[PDB]
Paper text:
However, compared to the pBF2*1501 complex, the α3 domain CD loop of complex A and complex B with intact mesh were pulled towards cCD8αα by approximately 4.2 Å and 3.8 Å in the cCD8αα/pBF2*1501 complex.
Residue numbers in the entry:
A (entry chain A): 4 to 273
B (entry chain C): 1 to 8
C (entry chain B): 2 to 99
Write the structure that this text describes.
């Protein structure tokens, strides 16, 4: 994927305490760049490159359509509860849509909704129809399939969203093209007959990374447990991989970090 | 930019 | 119903007497209603900030909670998580050098 634009939204009956019931977030190439919630009632910048390249009219405009959507989701919770015979209790409406520009120039457009975790409805852009995942989505399918909504959504995903993505990506040219070298630490812990070696990578960008444990040079892809890639507050990422070994084979083991910032994979020992 | 939506 | 996967970690490799940020990350949970609190010696940590609600392609929710701090020896840092899938509040102890 060359570039991606994605907007997500969540409508909740149970946020809960002191929390906004409606939250809406936007992403350019994975990076969080904008959000809106029901408490603040304003669509705001969440990065410097978006704020520097958008005026006041842009945000007023984004705020309006986020407030309009909020009301839709407010009534939407009531509508779906009546269709399911609820309350019920606590319920959630989720939506994600956007653009994927692929490395071959292919444009991918998606828009799909979910109720209470499970798939509700999705837009088939090629047939210009909405696919109902559940029986309760059928009335919604009928409403959307009547007007010009299909064409409007088709145009947005194929043109509008694509054209704005092309713009956002040039605004964040420098911040998105960043290379951040991970800070790596190796720690070892002796416990009741087993030695657990830990390998932590701190503050790398971009997100994709390969961290694995080697024994004498050969990768131990079986015994090793990974924590996956998790985000830091500043926009960088974090990961950890641990390995169980017989003590003391610490001299035999090596952590191999493979990342875009490194001209060759980093090797680390204990 | 965020798109416009319609009632469920 | 889905149980949150939680891990607590620091922004930089931890060193006592040095500016750092403690992060707590829960993922893969439903419903979105969750309580996540960073704590120092049983008392909520100062200046905690959290990201607005986000979810993956599989609709599972996630949240990051982080706070600036300076690590101290003989002081315990942990992340306390409450969720409806959990029978009791779960406490995740942070290991400064692991």
């Amino acid at each position: 994927e060359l570039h991606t634009l994605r907007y997500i939204s969540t409508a909740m009956t149970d946020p809960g305490p002191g929390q906004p019931w409606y939250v809406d977030v936007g992403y350019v190439d994975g990076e969080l760049f904008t959000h809106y919630n029901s408490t603040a009632r304003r669509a705001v910048p969440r990065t410097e490159w978006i704020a520097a390249n958008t005026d006041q009219q842009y945000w007023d405009s984004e705020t309006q359509t986020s407030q309009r959507t909020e009301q839709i989701d407010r009534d939407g919770l009531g509508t779906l509860q009546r269709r399911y015979n609820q309350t019920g209790g606590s319920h959630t409406v989720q939506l994600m849509y956007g653009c994927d520009i692929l490395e071959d120039g292919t444009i991918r457009g998606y828009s799909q909704d979910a109720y209470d975790g499970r798939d509700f409805i999705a837009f088939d852009k090629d047939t210009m129809t909405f696919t109902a995942a559940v029986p309760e989505a059928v009335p919604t399918k009928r409403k959307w399939e009547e007007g010009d909504y299909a064409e409007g959504l088709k145009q947005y995903l194929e043109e509008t969203c694509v054209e704005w993505l092309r713009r956002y990506v040039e605004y964040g040219k420098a911040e998105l093209g960043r290379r951040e070298r991970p800070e790596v630490r190796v720690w070892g812990k002796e416990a009741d007959g087993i030695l657990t070696l830990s390998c932590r990578a701190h503050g790398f960008y971009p997100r994709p990374i390969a961290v694995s444990w080697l024994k004498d040079g050969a990768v131990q892809g079986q015994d090793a447990q990974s924590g996956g890639i998790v985000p830091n507050g500043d926009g960088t990422y974090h990961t950890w991989v641990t390995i169980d070994a017989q003590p003391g084979d610490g001299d035999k083991y090596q952590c191999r970090v493979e990342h875009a910032s490194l001209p060759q994979p980093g090797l680390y020992s204990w | 930019r965020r798109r416009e939506q319609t009632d469920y | 119903d889905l149980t949150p996967k939680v891990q607590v970690y620091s922004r930089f490799p931890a060193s006592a007497g040095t500016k750092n940020v403690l992060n707590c990350f829960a993922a893969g949970f439903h419903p979105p209603k969750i309580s996540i609190t960073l704590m120092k010696d049983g008392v909520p940590m100062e200046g905690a900030q959290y990201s607005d609600m986000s979810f993956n392609d599989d609709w599972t929710f996630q949240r990051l909670v982080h706070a600036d701090f300076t690590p101290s020896s003989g002081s315990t840092y942990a992340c306390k998580v409450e969720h409806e899938t959990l029978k009791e509040p779960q406490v995740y102890k942070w290991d400064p050098e692991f």
